[PDB]
Design a protein around this ligand. Structure first.
Ligand SMILES: O=C(COc1ccccc1P(=O)(O)O)Nc1ccccc1Cl
Ligand SMILES: O=C(COc1ccccc1P(=O)(O)O)Nc1ccccc1Cl
Ligand SMILES: [Cl-]
Ligand SMILES: [Cl-]
Ligand SMILES: [Cl-]
Ligand SMILES: [Cl-]
Ligand SMILES: [Mg+2]
Ligand SMILES: [Mg+2]
Ligand SMILES: [Mg+2]
Ligand SMILES: [Mg+2]
Ligand SMILES: [Mg+2]
Ligand SMILES: [Mg+2]
Ligand SMILES: [Mg+2]
Ligand SMILES: [Mg+2]
Ligand SMILES: [Mg+2]
Ligand SMILES: [Mg+2]
Lengths: 228, 228
């Protein structure tokens, strides 16, 4: 539906949708922009991520309320409605994963773009894994793991330890280990090593970079407090 | 799309959607329930109102952000996107007004149902009037006025001055006079007479009815403070 709209107009409308808190519209504009086929700038990658994170975050919150009511009930209506919300969540994750596969990741050569997209791939497989069961669940968990691990390998070779995308990748992979992979010790070790290696590199930063990196460090420390 | 679902299942799913803060789903379930053709109970009328008030309230908030950016700009993109949001708002108001016209109001004989539906008719024409211009705007304003006035006439004959639906009707008609009809003195007189007549009737109420009525009285007093 966005094929007739100019790329620059889709980006401008995504920014308006964000100001209006219209995140489904924001995500549809950014999907249209990706589908023009050109690579995304740093600001445009952030608009894509913010749009879909807010859409899927509303779905995940609704799914968790519905799944809790269903587990306490355990007619068909709670399970049917939890399944409807689940299918729509799955469809948003499939959409994001499809944009990353066709063709954002294959054209991303710089570390900042490639790490960003592989982190998104890990996040959206992680959201699929939260609602998956059984075996299917195993291959979805391993897809999230594999995307996070490739992002981590690149980030350690190519970015300093205080880089905010490297920090946010390590924060989300630590949450994957704690909440999805049943690996709390791996989650704690990754968050602690990431925090400590960033702390040692803060002396290299400007005032504004120091604020950006310490913000994410405090999220690592908040989880370490929750988990220990 | 809801024709195959049982009435009672639509009501149950509306209540689940409300718990999940899924108000567009809530409104679609309640539209399906209205379209079964049976009259609505008091609880079901409240579910209908809450669902659509939250859907249209998100649209109105987005429209106001977009209209403010547009007025400060004054390419086509801000006006196009404000127009898209406006058209979708108009369509939700048309949907609600269509349910009231086909056939909720004509079968509503008791004062509590008929006042409730005529107040909704005034509210949704009021939301159309917020985004209307010019003449068209005049007939939409007079439709809101006419629906509120018929609701007021019934409410004064049939309900005590502390009845919460009568209080909420008077609060919203006062807002119509202040914000839509350019009649701040009428708004202030209606809110003050409504507050004072309810205050005089509170001695008749139970603890729980007194809480319900004083809550709405405090909204009347909050507007009187804003307007004087
Ligand atoms: O409460 C949270 C916290 O999740 C974190 C915390 C640290 C890093 C990454 C995440 P997330 O990618 O949202 O799971 N997320 C959440 C959970 C349900 C719906 C919406 C949101 Cl944003
Ligand atoms: O800030 C308000 C206050 O509106 C009142 C106040 C008293 C009575 C009725 C109304 P409303 O029917 O929401 O215009 N409403 C609002 C305005 C824009 C979007 C969402 C909402 Cl709920
Ligand atoms: Cl359903
Ligand atoms: Cl490449
Ligand atoms: Cl548009
Ligand atoms: Cl009748
Ligand atoms: Mg072009
Ligand atoms: Mg049932
Ligand atoms: Mg399922
Ligand atoms: Mg490239
Ligand atoms: Mg580098
Ligand atoms: Mg039936
Ligand atoms: Mg432009
Ligand atoms: Mg228009
Ligand atoms: Mg009847
Ligand atoms: Mg009576």
């Amino acid at each position: 539906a966005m094929g007739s709209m100019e790329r620059a107009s889709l980006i401008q409308k995504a920014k308006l949708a964000e100001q209006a808190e219209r995140y489904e519209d924001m995500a549809a504009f950014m999907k249209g922009a990706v589908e023009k086929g050109e690579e995304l700038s740093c600001e445009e990658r952030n608009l894509l991520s913010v749009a879909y994170k807010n859409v899927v975050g509303g779905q995940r919150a609704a799914w968790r309320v519905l799944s809790s009511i269903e587990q306490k009930s355990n007619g068909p209506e709670v399970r049917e409605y939890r399944e409807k919300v689940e299918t729509e969540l799955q469809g948003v994750c499939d959409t994001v994963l499809g944009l990353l596969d066709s063709h954002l990741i294959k054209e991303a050569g710089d570390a900042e773009s490639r790490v960003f997209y592989l982190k998104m791939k890990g996040d959206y497989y992680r959201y699929l894994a939260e609602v998956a069961t059984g075996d299917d669940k195993k291959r979805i968990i391993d897809s999230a793991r594999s995307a996070y691990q490739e992002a981590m390998d690149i980030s350690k070779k190519e970015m300093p330890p205080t880089n905010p995308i490297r920090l946010g990748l390590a924060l989300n992979f630590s949450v994957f280990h704690y909440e999805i992979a049943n690996s709390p010790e791996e989650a704690i070790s990754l968050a602690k090593t990431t925090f400590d290696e960033a702390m040692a590199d803060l002396h290299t930063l400007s005032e504004d970079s120091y604020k950006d990196s310490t913000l994410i460090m405090q999220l690592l420390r908040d989880n370490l407090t929750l988990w220990t």
